[PDB]
UniProtKB/Swiss-Prot annotation, chain B:
First-to-last residue of the parent protein present: 364 to 726 of 745
Gene: vat
Subunit structure comment from the entry: Homohexamer. Forms a ring-shaped particle.
Superkingdom, natural source: Archaea
Binding locations of ATP: G145, P146, P147, G148, V149, G150, K151, T152
Record organism: Thermoplasma acidophilum (strain ATCC 25905 / DSM 1728 / JCM 9062 / NBRC 15155 / AMRC-C165)
Name this polypeptide is given: VCP-like ATPase
Similarity annotation: Belongs to the AAA ATPase family. CDC48 subfamily.
Amino acid sequence: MESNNGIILRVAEANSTDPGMSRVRLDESSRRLLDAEIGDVVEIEKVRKTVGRVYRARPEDENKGIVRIDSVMRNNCGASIGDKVKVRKVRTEIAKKVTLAPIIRKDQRLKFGEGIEEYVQRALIRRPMLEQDNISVPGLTLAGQTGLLFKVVKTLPSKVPVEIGEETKIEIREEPASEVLEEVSRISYEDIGGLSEQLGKIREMIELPLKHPELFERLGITPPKGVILYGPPGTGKTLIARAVANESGANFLSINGPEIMSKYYGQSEQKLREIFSKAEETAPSIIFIDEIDSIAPKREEVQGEVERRVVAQLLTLMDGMKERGHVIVIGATNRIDAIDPALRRPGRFDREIEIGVPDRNGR
Amino acid sequence: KEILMIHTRNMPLGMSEEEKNKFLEEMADYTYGFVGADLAALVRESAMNALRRYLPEIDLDKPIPTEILEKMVVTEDDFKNALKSIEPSSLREVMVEVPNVHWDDIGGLEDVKREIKETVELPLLKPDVFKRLGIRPSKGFLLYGPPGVGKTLLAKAVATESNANFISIKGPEVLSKWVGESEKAIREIFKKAKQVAPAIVFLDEIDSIAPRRGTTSDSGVTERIVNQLLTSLDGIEVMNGVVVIGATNRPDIMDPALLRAGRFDKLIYIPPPDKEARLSILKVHTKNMPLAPDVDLNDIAQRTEGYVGADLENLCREAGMNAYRENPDATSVSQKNFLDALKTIRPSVDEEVIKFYRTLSET
């Protein structure tokens, strides 16, 4: 369960992408616990000693034992869902003059322009925040856009978390800023459309071993080796995979089926031998092949020993893993009927997942 | 031309006061087998074309008269005889080329052609701005419709418009290179275009790769070319100034996984022309050739309906032979010539292929 209750709560991903960045939604019952007004400014303290202030809002569908929260603060904090969080009411401190600059990675240092009053003044309305934080203003048109990343070097009042009001002066320098905080392009569970039941089901499998293996392996369950995904690929498969890896904190290792087939004796096996070699250090990590059906479709009626040696090389590498520094190999294909069942047994993927397609609700 | 002139620097024929067929550009249009020094050999072959006519008919010996060195010249024909004499060497491949095709040379249809403005040209000029707008247009489109009709010329049109040299990859071009297992080089052509960027990579009649090979031992049931195309897409992006352009007669039969969105996104249909476009494309052909308006260009448009651009570009081209003008078999342009051509030209007798497009394109 996600249960934690009272003035102290537990952090749970918001069940809606939410309109706002500072929206942290709590039920009437949950609000009565801390005794605060809807939309109140409350500074929440959490693990790692990282703090933030947010607005309260409401579903009617929540349980008082959780907190539906933005991905901004969780990313700024770097939180993995399931942490016990400490929240309390605090009166508002407000900025006077605020300086903002975008992060290095997102822009590449190629970006400059106008819109100080278009972005910030429109985002100048009622944003509670922590000083030294990456604040995001979305809008305009999509398909190149996920948020707009502004890192805070300074706020005229210093060493205080402050809400952004209408009386503050704003600045956009467009010069260097700290890149420490991730680009939202690096995924968040919110970026997965729907599939709430499938999200948690898959997540609990990889998460618990990847979090603390020393019981969930030792005193419980057993760690599996890999997971295969089904349904139309290229849409959620590549996204969900990195959406499992980034949030769990486990490093992500990219593979390409066609690149391996594009290669041959040597580099083909070197690569698969090179990746896992790199995985040992980053282990525990997430290993992923979207293309599983391309490299190992074999139903008998393929030909060469090169394709049989590399796929058989993959067979060896699976069993060669210790399940101690355990790493998880993920896979995806359009249909299970096409792929090879010799990859379906223990020693390797024994775990298969079926992902359907959205509906009027899923969309 | 700048290398040849160095061998014109080695000849006292004269140039830019002599302007004539001997102008080095017009002769440079004939030859790709060669490079700088091969031209030196060529002018030596041309210079030798001279000596073989001159010196033998003189029957020279240790005495060399001065008059010959004076009265002797180097004509334009010996170059042709040197150009028709060939020793092709330079690497087997297709090379970048800049055509003259443009909106002026395409009668076509403004509706589908106009979409090419925003599809290609705009992404070319402003790849950094769409980031500001927060937009990432597609990676390429796919043309399908009646065979011929100039669908190949449509890309040569945006080629000169894009102000970038052009490469056309056609099915037969891959097959000849495929026998040598050079498909890896076919992929290198794309990395080559990148080093030459901006440049346009045009995949033509890509449905022409599979038909001859059925299903045989390629990468397995899916082609290695498909494997090369999948990897070809790994390198490029919407960021690069290089543009992928699909053109296909049958954008179904092969392996739709590669035709899947994210690989080739936009599905664009080339419809057959109509009375007006039939007339416009007709006016473009007849303006170059001498015209006696005994025909009524609207009347021969009455006769003509259901004729694709291929038949028209061929009909415009085919009736030209039946008509004779500036020689003494002459018969001027008349409805009789276009009347006899009406029987020679094959109409569109298959509405099947037409309805597969319309039904599939609509829903």
